[PDB]
Design a protein around this ligand. Structure first.
Ligand SMILES: Nc1nc2c(ncn2[C@@H]2O[C@H](COP(=O)(O)OP(=O)(O)NP(=O)(O)O)[C@@H](O)[C@H]2O)c(=O)[nH]1
Ligand SMILES: C[C@@H](Nc1nc(Nc2ccc(F)c(Cl)c2)nc2ccccc12)C1CC1
Ligand SMILES: [Mg+2]
Ligand code: NA
Lengths: 469, 167, 166
């Protein structure tokens, strides 16, 4: 027989399942909707563990439950009453004998200990992976420390002492590789001569590598707290989504820098060399699976100032036109080919974040917070699961590091890139378009000639790596 | 076979712009959505008795990727320029969106509609007359929509398709 | 993309979590924080085919020993881990092997025997003894170090190959 449960009058998590409090999707069940009590019961269920559910819940719960209330509810879940002695136990005690306590022992082993351990696993995941709740509410942290630090009894003792230490470490808070990273490559600019660094004087291989390390670090720094609730679109976005915004602003700046390098090169032959070099950088981005970098280049080539430069495009070699066309096609048909390629490559990679943002936003805007059933409002949990499937995909690509060596000077050069200067966006993008009109006027105006601006060789060293002993 | 129209939604973020396409494409009568689903942005419709396929690009949420706007806009034949009727800044942004569309398409006569979107019950700050006057100064239609009742949504998209057909 | 459900089992402290985090993040965890249950995902190309590994990292502490059936039902393949400087953990291997066989009602479950902490000089379980046990199970034996990465990809990706050929 199934174990008997505490009375639902003294322990709220023993109410029977019904369509008035939980709805399952059509081999563990998948929850479509439920009351917060039923969600917490299934989060800490005695029959099975559900690590996906724990991540989904802890990532998304603040849209339906405050952090203080979540802690109260899991403490309530933890405090499970033990059953009274049975008739057989009673008769043994009346004869001065020790009772067998078979039902009590089974209920401890198969209900209390799994539920309590799974509550502690929620606490552990909460502290390790969602610690911002405690950084932003010091009183919440005090309550968690107090709860964990007063759990008695030896069955939980190893995990109680461990979680206490994890909390203390989180309050005051190294990579190994299969191989050595390749040698840093240099072209016209030599090591230490940061004043000469530029698009054509750094080695195109090393430009792509150092931008990939920078863009990988920016990608890896974005936490789910910056995404859930669509907070990067709201008035407090600078407060709630700073790592995401830093990542996007880097991408915008690099795209504008590519555009500025192109249209400020007024001599046609020199501008062809600039565009060819950027396509070579794109080729190395592709080899590195840096899709953010790929699209930084594609966006620049499709911008209004650059796209119209027919005289420049006409002189790009056919093999480079083919590289650029293939990269452009990743974005066509709502990123159909990009999505397939991302799902096929061997990481490390740098995804393009924009698709994730649109899908999180539309998932949150296009599904209701609650479902109404039999006069009750149930939390629409399927909507939160869809959001957490996206944040989980994001996190999966955040794990793998690049086996590339940092060059601190090249890193700083790209960190400090500021193509707009002090200009506002509209003034700057109008400037770029007017430069485009200057260097290749609208027909039927004649094409002017312009003097060279670069005193060094324009020949590319290419993008195949070298290896001395 | 049937004509396909590539439509692009543009406008300020954070003020409910995405509700326009979601409500159109939705199971009109079930309030549910998965945007990751292959062709959650394609819809076959009958407009003035002629069947066509709408392909709608709405990059809502990517507004900070400002250097990608040109690329996204280039894909479109017709544009819905959306502001929120309770956000004057989003209305003041419209002029620059329209100027950017004209530059990207290299035309002074690009099919487009002005859409005023009621995204919540906060007080309206852009009156109908203000937006009608702006649309008339541009020579384009004005449609007002509700982000919650689906009112105006079909009118916004069908009016844009008629602008393309009559270009 | 084929999805594979891997489960890492073995006695407390043998390095199940350190092995998993080394695979996932290329990082060695020095702390000993006993696991209750954790899960990880990894996209990776193995023998030219892209797949998605779901990795369940389980509890070795004896206090959790009554909670194993639920994760054994879901797993497709199992890394059975002991530490080569801990003879009791090696003796515990057969209990995991027999429980997996009972739960899945099968004599033919994909498994790999893993002898971890092979960076440590003071070995107490000889390779020959573990290899004999592996042969009796019909499975490969791979020695690993979560600290240095020795054998780590080999252990996990061999298990993928055995699920694939199952
Ligand atoms: N030298 C060395 N130490 C290791 C290795 N693997 C794990 N350790 C160490 O052994 C300790 C226990 O590791 P851990 O991964 O937590 O083991 P576990 O099997 O997951 N323990 P549990 O079953 O309680 O979750 C840690 O201090 C860890 O750094 C290894 O390959 N070499
Ligand atoms: C593959 C590329 N296709 C095209 N690009 C450009 N122009 C352009 C591109 C790159 C440049 F470096 C410069 Cl200078 C100009 N014009 C086109 C005109 C008609 C048809 C296709 C075009 C797209 C990724 C941009
Ligand atoms: Mg562990
Ligand atoms: Na306003």
């Amino acid at each position: 027989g199934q174990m008997r449960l505490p009375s639902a009058d003294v322990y709220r998590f023993a109410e029977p399942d019904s369509e008035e409090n939980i709805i399952f999707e059509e081999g563990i069940p998948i929850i479509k909707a439920g009351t917060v009590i039923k969600l917490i019961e299934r989060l800490t269920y005695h029959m099975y563990a559900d690590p996906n559910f724990v991540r989904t819940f802890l990532t998304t719960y603040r849209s339906f439950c405050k952090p203080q209330e979540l802690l109260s509810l899991i403490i309530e879940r933890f405090e499970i009453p033990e059953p009274e002695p049975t008739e057989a136990d009673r008769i043994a005690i009346e004869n001065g004998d020790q009772p067998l306590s078979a039902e009590l022992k089974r209920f401890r082993k198969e209900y209390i200990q799994p539920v309590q351990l799974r509550v502690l696993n929620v606490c552990r995941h909460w502290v390790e992976h969602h610690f911002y709740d405690f950084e932003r509410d010091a009183y919440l942290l005090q309550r968690m420390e107090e709860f964990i630090g007063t759990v008695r009894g030896k069955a939980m003792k190893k995990w109680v002492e461990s979680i206490t230490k994890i909390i203390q470490r989180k309050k005051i808070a190294n990579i190994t590789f299969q191989s050595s990273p390749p040698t840093v490559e240099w072209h016209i600019s030599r090591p230490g001569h940061i004043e000469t660094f530029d698009l054509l004087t750094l080695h195109p291989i090393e430009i792509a590598r150092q931008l990939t390390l920078l863009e990988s670090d920016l990608y890896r720094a974005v936490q789910p707290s910056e995404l859930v609730g669509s907070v990067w679109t709201k008035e407090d976005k600078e407060i709630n989504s700073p790592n995401l915004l830093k990542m996007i602003r880097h991408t915008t700046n690099l795209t504008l820098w590519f555009e500025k390098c192109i249209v400020e090169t007024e001599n046609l032959e020199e501008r062809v060399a600039v565009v060819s070099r950027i396509i070579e950088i794109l080729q190395v981005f592709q080899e590195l699976n840096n899709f953010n970098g790929v699209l930084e280049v594609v966006s620049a080539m499709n911008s209004s100032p650059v796209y119209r430069l027919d005289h420049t495009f006409e002189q790009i070699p056919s093999r480079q036109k083919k590289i650029l066309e293939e990269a452009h096609e990743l974005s066509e048909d709502h990123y159909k080919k990009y999505l397939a390629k991302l799902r096929s490559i061997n990481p490390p990679c740098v995804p393009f974040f924009g698709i994730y943002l649109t899908n999180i936003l539309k998932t949150e805007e296009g599904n209701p917070e609650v479902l109404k059933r039999h006069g009750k409002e149930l939390i629409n949990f399927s909507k939160r699961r869809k959001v957490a499937e996206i944040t989980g995909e994001i996190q999966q690509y955040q794990n793998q590091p690049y086996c590339l060596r940092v060059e601190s000077d090249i890193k700083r050069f790209f960190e400090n890139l500021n193509p707009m200067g002090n200009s506002m966006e509209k003034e700057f993008t109008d400037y770029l378009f007017n430069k485009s009109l200057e260097i290749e006027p609208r027909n039927p105006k004649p094409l002017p000639r312009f003097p060279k601006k670069y005193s060094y060789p324009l020949k590319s060293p290419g993008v195949r790596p070298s290896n001395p002993r | 076979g049937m004509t396909e129209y590539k439509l692009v939604v543009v406008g300020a973020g954070g003020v409910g712009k995405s509700a326009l396409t979601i409500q159109l494409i939705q199971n009109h009568f079930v309030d549910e959505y998965d945007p990751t689903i292959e062709d959650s942005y394609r819809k076959q419709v009958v407009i003035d008795g002629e069947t066509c396929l709408l392909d709608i690009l709405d990059t809502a949420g990517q507004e900070e990727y400002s250097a990608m706007r040109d690329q996204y806009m280039r894909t479109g034949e017709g544009f819905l320029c959306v502001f929120a009727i309770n956000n004057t800044k989003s209305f003041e942004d419209i002029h620059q969106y329209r100027e950017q569309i004209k530059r990207v398409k290299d035309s002074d006569d690009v099919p487009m509609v002005l859409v005023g979107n009621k995204c919540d019950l906060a007080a309206r700050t852009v009156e109908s007359r203000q937006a009608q006057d702006l649309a008339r100064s541009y020579g384009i239609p004005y449609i007002e929509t509700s982000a919650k009742t689906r009112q105006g949504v079909e009118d916004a998209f069908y009016t844009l398709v008629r602008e393309i057909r009559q270009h």
